[PDB]
Amino acid sequence: AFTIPVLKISEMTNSRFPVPVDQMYTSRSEGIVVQPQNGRATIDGELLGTTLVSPVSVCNFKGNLQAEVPGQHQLYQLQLTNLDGSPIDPTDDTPGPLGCPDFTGLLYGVASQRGPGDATRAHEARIDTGSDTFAPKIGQVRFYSTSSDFETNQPTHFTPIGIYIEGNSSDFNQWQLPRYGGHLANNNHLAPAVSPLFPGEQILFFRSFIPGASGHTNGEMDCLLPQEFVQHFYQEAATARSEVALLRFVNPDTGRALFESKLHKQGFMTIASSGDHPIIMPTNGYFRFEAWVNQFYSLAPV
Amino acid sequence: AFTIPVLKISEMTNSRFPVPVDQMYTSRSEGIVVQPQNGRATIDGELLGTTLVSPVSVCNFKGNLQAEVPGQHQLYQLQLTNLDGSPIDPTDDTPGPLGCPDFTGLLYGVASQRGPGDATRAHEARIDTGSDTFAPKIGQVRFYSTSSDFETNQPTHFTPIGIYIEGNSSDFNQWQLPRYGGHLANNNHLAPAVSPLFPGEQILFFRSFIPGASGHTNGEMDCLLPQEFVQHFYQEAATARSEVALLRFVNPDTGRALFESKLHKQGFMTIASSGDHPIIMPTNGYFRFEAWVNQFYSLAPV
Ligand SMILES: CC(=O)N[C@@H]1[C@@H](O[C@@H]2O[C@@H](C)[C@@H](O)[C@@H](O)[C@@H]2O)[C@H](O[C@@H]2O[C@H](CO)[C@H](O)[C@H](O)[C@H]2O[C@@H]2O[C@@H](C)[C@@H](O)[C@@H](O)[C@@H]2O)[C@@H](CO)O[C@@H]1O
Ligand SMILES: CC(=O)N[C@@H]1[C@@H](O[C@@H]2O[C@@H](C)[C@@H](O)[C@@H](O)[C@@H]2O)[C@H](O[C@@H]2O[C@H](CO)[C@H](O)[C@H](O)[C@H]2O[C@@H]2O[C@@H](C)[C@@H](O)[C@@H](O)[C@@H]2O)[C@@H](CO)O[C@@H]1O
């Protein structure tokens, strides 16, 4: 029996950045390819892209502080491990290491170290996921920091915080996939792009406004499934009885349905709507499974 | 029926700090009162203390940047809201706001703002959860920052990163509860201290090594239940058929089991062990629910 966990929008976690979901949101996505690599799981529990189940790991990095890069002030070279400590293995059937950012921008966070012994230090750091030498697929990532207080050959962790806007082309683009293998290699093993195929339908996104560390940005980060759904599908591994799980968003306060959504087998939701806008609903509302239908099922407008 | 999710230790999230669990750990906890307020839930789904379900929210704060504290350089007064945006209500049946830190120390992180408009800024911040002024229960919390780039009367978020060790009395003590009401107040609505009551048993902890930002610290943070168990019990609300759920740590690699543990109804686990030490197990190992036993069920040592 297929189920969805009972969660208010305000209890959901974004699957593309480690923060709560702020609102549901829908868009025409005009002139945009929606192909996020985090928050990708089929409803029968297969993880795609760089998707992992830990809800606090996405956009984090871990590894050895190999050296300060020659000829650049306080730019530091990491030799990544996987976030669980296992070594990076570029033969993996993934675009890059699990949890790797799936967007281009100036990722702002903090680089911390423990070592030698139990000595520690941390400072503000920035990773440009759009730069030529950003190549997490093979464990090669650099971070800039304003501090020189870092030890070489000590275990180092990058904790993501938000985006840093300089006001340029290096500006946060949530839909532009990074080149996981650096400027000299092409991406492989990507989770496929998704789009609404039925007329009058749009994708339903779970949107957070991630912190901004500089410049003007609303920090919009849209995921196709909250992390809790990813986790649940992975746990249940229930077999999809059809291409579409029909869901009802219900308001427990009144006992009635607010709208319907098509949860597609491959792990995204559509609703009947038009335009770019938030979907603001009674705080207590939640999705529940109604029935298995086909991809041609017709939804009533949200 | 009662279940627990299938999770490797490395897939678990600490329920007292938003980072993955690093290892299982057990201790005599000699002359220590084990009374964490985060990651507290009964196995039938009742959340206790300051425990919330979101796995990315613990140790975060949200609030208005009221002003800079007079006569003190770059110390800033927050007027907290709840993490959900609602006003702080000191009459809540909680020791303090959900997700509030449950230890005393120099909590290191980043304070960010968005406003006016979509202008943003973020800088390192430290909050001393042990200072007299720390009074989250009534929404009064201060943070120190090395930057003066903060706007008064703009929405402010504190994202936790780790602990800052000055090497003095304000040093991290994971088992010392803060005075949630501030220096002139006694705590209330506390989740109870826990201990092994059966001879030969000790509590099984889920330990993380949280980042240190300065000084010497192992950053040891022990929780009674991974956040995933908290979330599961909350979702399931299954009736506890006895006082103790018997769990077995199984190794899927071999099909053989390694040890058993008693999951007590009030939300902590014990094992038959003696001494302070990590419990290292094959990395693919996980807990499985076996039976409903009582508090006198006798376990083979680990
Ligand atoms: C970290 C840092 O110092 N960054 C600055 C940046 O200021 C930051 O962001 C602005 C918007 C504000 O929130 C500051 O508190 C914050 O530190 C600078 O941006 C300009 O900041 C000044 C600050 O007085 C004005 O607010 C100005 O309007 C900002 O310019 C805008 O944002 C820039 C990033 C550009 O996009 C520009 O076209 C915008 O008008 C910038 C430039 O001075 O420098 C660092 O990035
Ligand atoms: C952030 C910061 O600058 N804090 C310093 C702190 O240095 C930090 O901690 C040490 C252990 C090391 O990891 C540094 O890289 C890190 O920035 C200072 O601590 C001293 O630092 C020097 C190195 O610059 C030595 O390592 C020295 O042993 C450190 O003192 C020890 O740690 C202190 C926290 C005290 O407990 C002291 O008794 C220890 O001997 C301190 C003191 O200089 O000042 C800032 O806080």
Author numbering:
A (entry chain A), B (entry chain B): 226 to 527
The publication says:
Norovirus capsid displays an icosahedral symmetry that is composed of 180 copies of a single major structural protein, the capsid protein (VP1), which organize into 90 dimers. Each VP1 can be divided into two major domains, the N-terminal shell (S) and the C-terminal protruding (P) domains, linked by a short hinge. The P domain is further divided into P1 and P2 subdomains, forming the leg and the head of the protruding P dimer, respectively. Expression of the S domain alone formed smooth, thin-layer S particles without the protruding structures, while production of P domain in vitro resulted in P dimer, P particle, and small P particle. Functional analyses showed that the P dimer and the P particle, but not the S particle, bind to histo-blood group antigens (HBGAs), the host susceptible factors of noroviruses (see below), indicating that the P domain is the HBGA binding domain.
Co-crystallization of the P protein with Ley and SLex tetrasaccharides has resulted in crystals in a new form of space group P212121 instead of the P21212 native form. In both complex crystals the four saccharide rings could be clearly discerned from the (fo-fc) electron density map at a resolution of 2Å, and their structures were modeled accordingly. Most residues from 226 to 527 could be modeled in the electron density map, while residues 295 to 297 and 392 to 394 could not be modeled due to lack of interpretable electron density map in these loop regions. However, in both complex structures with the Ley and SLex tetrasaccharides, the above missing residues could be modeled, suggesting that binding to either of the two tetrasaccharides stabilizes the two flexible loops. The carbohydrate binding site of VA207 is located at the distal surface of the P dimer, corresponding to the outermost surface of a norovirus capsid. The binding pocket for the Ley and SLex tetrasaccharide is constituted by 7 amino acid residues, of which T345, R346, and D374 are from one protomer forming the “bottom” (T345 and R346) and a “wall” (D374), while G440, H441, S439 and Y389 are from the other protomer constituting the other “walls” of the pocket. Extensive hydrogen bond networks were observed between these amino acid residues and the tetrasaccharides of the Lewis antigens. In particular, T345, R346, D374 and G440 interact with the α-1, 3 fucose (Lewis epitope), Y389 and S439 with the N-acetylglucosamine saccharide, one of the two precursor saccharides, and H441 with the α-1, 2 fucose (H epitope on Ley tetrasaccharide) via a water molecule as a bridge. It is noted that 5 of the 7 amino acid residues that participate directly in interaction of VA207 with the Ley antigen are conserved in VA387 (GII.4), supporting the notion that these two GII strains share a conserved genogroup II HBGA-binding interface as predicted previously.
